[PDB]
Design an enzyme around this catalytic site. Structure first.
Site, short mmCIF file in Angstrom:
data_model
loop_
_atom_site.label_atom_id
_atom_site.label_comp_id
_atom_site.label_asym_id
_atom_site.label_seq_id
_atom_site.Cartn_x
_atom_site.Cartn_y
_atom_site.Cartn_z
N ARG A 53 13.60 -6.63 3.12
CA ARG A 53 12.91 -5.62 2.33
C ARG A 53 13.54 -5.03 1.33
O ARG A 53 13.02 -4.44 0.58
CB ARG A 53 12.37 -4.40 3.23
N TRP A 109 11.46 -16.27 0.81
CA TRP A 109 12.18 -17.38 1.18
C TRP A 109 12.88 -17.25 2.49
O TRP A 109 12.94 -16.03 3.21
CB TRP A 109 13.37 -17.49 -0.01
N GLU A 113 15.51 -18.34 11.26
CA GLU A 113 14.29 -18.63 11.61
C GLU A 113 13.85 -20.02 11.99
O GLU A 113 13.17 -20.65 12.56
CB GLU A 113 13.36 -18.08 10.58
C1 HEM Z 1 12.11 -12.77 0.40
C2 HEM Z 1 12.66 -12.94 1.24
C3 HEM Z 1 12.25 -12.51 2.82
C4 HEM Z 1 12.99 -12.64 3.94
C5 HEM Z 1 14.20 -13.38 3.98
C6 HEM Z 1 12.09 -12.11 4.93
C7 HEM Z 1 12.31 -12.30 6.32
C8 HEM Z 1 11.67 -11.86 7.41
C9 HEM Z 1 11.80 -12.12 9.04
C10 HEM Z 1 13.13 -12.96 9.40
C11 HEM Z 1 11.10 -11.73 9.67
C12 HEM Z 1 10.90 -11.65 11.13
C13 HEM Z 1 10.15 -12.99 11.31
C14 HEM Z 1 10.46 -13.46 12.87
O1 HEM Z 1 11.87 -13.54 13.06
O2 HEM Z 1 9.70 -13.50 13.84
C15 HEM Z 1 9.85 -11.01 8.72
C16 HEM Z 1 8.98 -10.27 8.89
C17 HEM Z 1 7.80 -9.74 8.09
N1 HEM Z 1 7.65 -10.08 6.73
FE1 HEM Z 1 9.57 -10.54 5.50
N2 HEM Z 1 10.84 -11.87 4.31
C18 HEM Z 1 10.80 -11.88 3.04
C19 HEM Z 1 9.81 -11.52 2.27
C20 HEM Z 1 8.67 -10.92 2.50
C21 HEM Z 1 7.43 -10.81 1.67
C22 HEM Z 1 7.41 -11.16 0.16
C23 HEM Z 1 6.37 -10.03 2.56
C24 HEM Z 1 5.10 -9.40 1.96
C25 HEM Z 1 4.73 -9.58 0.77
C26 HEM Z 1 6.99 -9.96 3.67
C27 HEM Z 1 6.49 -9.36 4.84
C28 HEM Z 1 6.82 -9.40 6.10
C29 HEM Z 1 5.94 -9.11 7.30
C30 HEM Z 1 4.48 -8.40 7.04
C31 HEM Z 1 6.45 -9.31 8.32
C32 HEM Z 1 6.04 -9.13 9.91
C33 HEM Z 1 6.33 -7.55 10.17
C34 HEM Z 1 5.71 -6.87 11.15
O3 HEM Z 1 4.81 -7.33 11.83
O4 HEM Z 1 5.98 -5.75 11.46
N3 HEM Z 1 8.30 -10.46 3.85
N4 HEM Z 1 10.39 -11.14 7.37
C1 LIG Z 2 3.52 -14.15 16.51
C2 LIG Z 2 3.95 -12.74 16.16
C3 LIG Z 2 4.41 -12.47 14.85
O1 LIG Z 2 5.56 -13.47 14.29
C4 LIG Z 2 5.86 -13.50 13.12
C5 LIG Z 2 5.35 -12.52 12.40
C6 LIG Z 2 5.82 -12.53 10.97
C7 LIG Z 2 6.67 -13.32 10.43
C8 LIG Z 2 7.13 -13.73 9.22
C9 LIG Z 2 6.24 -13.32 8.12
C10 LIG Z 2 6.55 -13.50 6.58
C11 LIG Z 2 7.98 -14.14 6.29
C12 LIG Z 2 8.18 -14.24 4.96
C13 LIG Z 2 7.17 -13.78 4.12
C14 LIG Z 2 9.59 -14.74 5.04
C15 LIG Z 2 10.32 -15.23 5.96
N1 LIG Z 2 11.40 -15.88 5.74
N2 LIG Z 2 9.98 -15.06 7.42
C16 LIG Z 2 8.82 -14.44 7.58
C17 LIG Z 2 8.38 -14.27 8.86
C18 LIG Z 2 6.90 -14.65 11.36
C19 LIG Z 2 6.46 -14.69 12.84
C20 LIG Z 2 7.15 -15.58 13.77
N3 LIG Z 2 6.90 -15.15 15.02
CL LIG Z 3 8.42 -20.17 10.02
#
Ligand code: HEM
Ligand SMILES: CCCOc1ccc(-c2ccc3c(C)cc(N)nc3c2)cc1CN
Ligand SMILES: [Cl-]
Ligand code: HEM
Ligand SMILES: CCCOc1ccc(-c2ccc3c(C)cc(N)nc3c2)cc1CN
Ligand SMILES: C[C@H](O)[C@H](O)[C@H]1CNc2nc(N)[nH]c(=O)c2N1
Ligand SMILES: C[C@H](O)[C@H](O)[C@H]1CNc2nc(N)[nH]c(=O)c2N1
Ligand SMILES: [Cl-]
Ligand SMILES: [Gd]
Ligand SMILES: [Gd]
Ligand SMILES: [Zn+2]
EC number: 1.14.13.39
Lengths: 404, 402
Positions: free
Chosen positions: B109, B278, B283
């Site tokens: 973020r 990205w 992950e």
């Molecule tokens: C640009 C680099 C970004 C990185 C490195 C990143 C990384 C991550 C990671 C590692 C997660 C948790 C996923 C998991 O392990 O299951 C996550 C969740 C999430 N990301 Fe990011 N993300 C990026 C960009 C974005 C963007 C551009 C958006 C939306 C415009 C976004 C929105 C979200 C949302 C909605 C979640 C789920 C959060 C929740 O359910 O509370 N991300 N992100």
């Molecule tokens: C199934 C429950 C919800 O899980 C989730 C929920 C969210 C994301 C998620 C969403 C967006 C991402 C972006 C934009 C970049 C990144 N690098 N990673 C992301 C990971 C992955 C998972 C995998 N579990």
């Molecule tokens: Cl993935």
């Protein structure tokens, strides 16, 4: 009744035991505070209802709910507090309470062992030299030449008016922490405060970074009295690596017995502010937390130089490679010395089968996800993918103010 | 009466006054904590819209002005005539950014202000939906120098059905059931694969077969769209000092684009708004390749490394996992595809938390999701207490349209 899912297998259970949770924790529908270490902060009519509940569940556990000495035992505690204002616990009740407090500890991953626990009654105690000899019995029995045995000893319960037994060290075995001319620390920065108090009560300091601290023991009312520990009773493991020949020359050591001496045991509405318990270590507690945390011994960068790793970019994952070797050396060193230790994979697999046991027994189990999951390799262990419910059942161990 | 938050590596103390404004309730009570769960009309549409408008006019340092009170009076009378209202373009851009800013499980973020918002609210069909998506992928991928982007399809409205992307991500690999009951490819994607097949798709039999898009226009069946291969940038995985690694045949794709969440702004609901950033390397390495229910390559890696897999105390799982992550970071750097490791990522999130304390007085964060799935306490987020709460605008899970 919370629906809890395991995401690795797909199985679903329901925590019906949560519905009997008492001492309200820290969370509200607006904000979750599960990640805080200390939740929030730290007319005897309520003593009855807490003793009534505890005695009720004692007799359920041994079949004797309904008829017999069950109702009988309800009356003695009623009359004993009506007369005195407190009550004395029976021996089997003190042992059953001690085991349940361990069974209810949300953050303990070793709870598959909760049924095997040696409970030394020290409620007779009434002296500081007395408790010091009580403490040395525990250690001796717990250490057992390295084949470790879970043990707690219970010192006299707090009484309204007049003081409390209190061990001032957070653990029975703790390493010194001396501040340098730099203000930095030789030794364990965790224990720079208690080292400060040890000295200002007549302790003479020592060498450096692995000095075992003296016990500051506090009999009621009179002040704390220092007590030196015999080196023979403090079993330690020098740390060596099975294939990195230089790791031993780093001169790292750790002790065998984790024995926490600053928590408060609460059984049936009675508070035991001195009740030190001990088990054996999980390897990651030593290797990853005690030795690698930036505010602890902080050895990770030093071990990485010796492995000739690229410490100039985080993308080389040099911290990750160094940490694993530190954990390998801990496991190897404790094993070489025939001292009980458990790796975090073995330990978390046992916790899963504890969860399954506790599902059948009590319909659930309080568990604190952030403390159950190991501090390295989390998602490689089964508990990572297991949803958990955290809540507070009694009997229990609680955190307590420190006596200063 | 606001939560006291402590950092244990350093000794910092702050309070989260932003939590007190949390405009939704979650699954916890004083009786029990459920933090670890994965999945936790006009007058109320009007009260959400007013809080958003107030937010927007604050961000442009124009709170309480005539232009502010105008827009309030405007949206209120628009809900009266039609039961809904329309965002202006600037309000939409700000709302998408705020949704990312407020996402409690997102460690990336620190970037939230740098977001490319594509306004596809004029989309009329699935075919056109396909065109907008292909352009999103092309701009975000950017030949491996990835850019954060979101495309916003028409809002939920009374009288018509929703746009829905049935696929959870724009790029996913097929999961094929076997005769052993086993799965070739990604097991997380076995259902969408079945769906795609019965909607006409001729399935492959590889382990890294990219799935077609199932795209749903209002009140229509989903339609099947093949992604041109040259739009889908992929990275074959190799290890820099373990040359047998390349012979595994493993690949992963450049672009993580999540397509099945719901974007909520000011009471409005956008059920189709795919976004992309990205990857953080854990992950791919830890979760997607090593989870026992995913590609599950860990044991095969460790045996090839000549590790002793008879006993857990040799830590064979930890060693193989660290080398699978090294391979991911090296492969993407070699292919010139953006990627961040969990150490840099968590360090940047710490800066985000400090930026956010000064800016809004706190920050919603889910500790169990912010802390990476390997080497947790080696990163600075492990030692930071966090407060989790729901702010709006926001992204939200929604049920599968099937
Ligand atoms: C640009 C680099 C970004 C990185 C490195 C990143 C990384 C991550 C990671 C590692 C997660 C948790 C996923 C998991 O392990 O299951 C996550 C969740 C999430 N990301 Fe990011 N993300 C990026 C960009 C974005 C963007 C551009 C958006 C939306 C415009 C976004 C929105 C979200 C949302 C909605 C979640 C789920 C959060 C929740 O359910 O509370 N991300 N992100
Ligand atoms: C199934 C429950 C919800 O899980 C989730 C929920 C969210 C994301 C998620 C969403 C967006 C991402 C972006 C934009 C970049 C990144 N690098 N990673 C992301 C990971 C992955 C998972 C995998 N579990
Ligand atoms: Cl993935
Ligand atoms: C037998 C092997 C045991 C192992 C491997 C073990 C392991 C652990 C671990 C890993 C923690 C997490 C704390 C941290 O890492 O910071 C913990 C906490 C704790 N343990 Fe155990 N332990 C064992 C035995 C015991 C015994 C014998 C007792 C008491 C009779 C006990 C009671 C507790 C309590 C009360 C806490 C923390 C308080 C709370 O979680 O609310 N454990 N233990
Ligand atoms: C810092 C606030 C409280 O932290 C705590 C709280 C509790 C324990 C703890 C207590 C007992 C243990 C036993 C019997 C065996 C073992 N193997 N480990 C233990 C760990 C460590 C810490 C260190 N963080
Ligand atoms: C901030 C965070 O809650 C805190 O650092 C916790 C997280 N999980 C932990 N888990 C264990 N086992 N021991 C700890 O000290 C901590 N610390
Ligand atoms: C049960 C458990 O809470 C769940 O599997 C969560 C834990 N934390 C996570 N954290 C991240 N970043 N991604 C995940 O998929 C998960 N899974
Ligand atoms: Cl310890
Ligand atoms: Gd050398
Ligand atoms: Gd090689
Ligand atoms: Zn909670």
């Amino acid at each position: 009744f919370p629906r809890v899912k395991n995401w690795e297998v797909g199985s679903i259970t329901y925590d019906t035991l949560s519905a009997q949770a008492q001492q309200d924790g820290p969370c509200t529908p607006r904000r979750c505070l599960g990640s805080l270490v200390f939740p929030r902060k730290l007319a005897p009519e309520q003593l009855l209802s807490q003793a009534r509940d505890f005695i009720n569940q004692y007799y359920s556990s041994i079949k004797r709910s309904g008829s017999q000495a069950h109702e009988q035992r309800l009356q003695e505690v009623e009359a004993e507090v009506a007369a005195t204002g407190t009550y004395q616990l029976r021996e089997s009740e003190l042992v059953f309470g001690a085991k349940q407090a361990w069974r209810n500890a949300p953050r303990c991953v070793g709870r598959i062992q909760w049924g095997k626990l040696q409970v030394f009654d020290a409620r007779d105690c009434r002296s500081a030299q007395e408790m010091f000899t009580y403490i040395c019995n525990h250690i001796k029995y717990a250490t057992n030449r390295g084949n470790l045995r879970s043990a707690i000893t219970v010192f006299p319960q707090r009484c309204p008016g007049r003081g409390d037994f209190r061990i001032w060290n957070s653990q029975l075995v703790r390493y010194a922490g001396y501040r340098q001319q730099d203000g930095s620390v030789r030794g364990d920065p965790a224990n720079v405060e208690i080292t400060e108090l040890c000295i200002q009560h007549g302790w003479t300091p020592g060498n450096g970074r692995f000095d075992v601290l003296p016990l500051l023991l506090q009999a009621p009312d009179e002040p704390p009295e220092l007590f030196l520990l015999p080196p023979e009773l403090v079993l330690e493991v020098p740390l060596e690596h099975p294939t990195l020949e230089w790791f031993a020359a780093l001169g790292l050591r750790w002790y065998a017995l984790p024995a926490v001496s600053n928590m408060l045991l609460e059984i049936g509405g009675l508070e035991f502010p001195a009740a030190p318990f001990s088990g054996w270590y999980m390897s990651t507690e030593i290797g990853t937390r005690n030795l690698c945390d930036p505010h602890r011994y902080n050895i990770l960068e030093d071990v990485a130089v010796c492995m000739d790793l690229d410490t100039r970019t985080t993308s080389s994952l040099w911290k990750d490679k160094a940490a694993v070797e530190i954990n390998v050396a801990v496991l190897h060193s404790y094993q070489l010395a025939k001292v009980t230790i458990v790796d975090h994979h073995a330990a978390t697999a046992s916790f899963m089968k504890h969860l399954e046991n506790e599902q059948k027994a009590r319909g659930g189990c309080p568990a604190d996800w952030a403390w159950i999951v190991p501090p390295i390799s989390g998602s490689l262990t089964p508990v990572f993918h297991q949803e958990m419910v955290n809540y507070f059942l009694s009997p229990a161990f609680r955190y307590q103010p420190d006596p200063w």
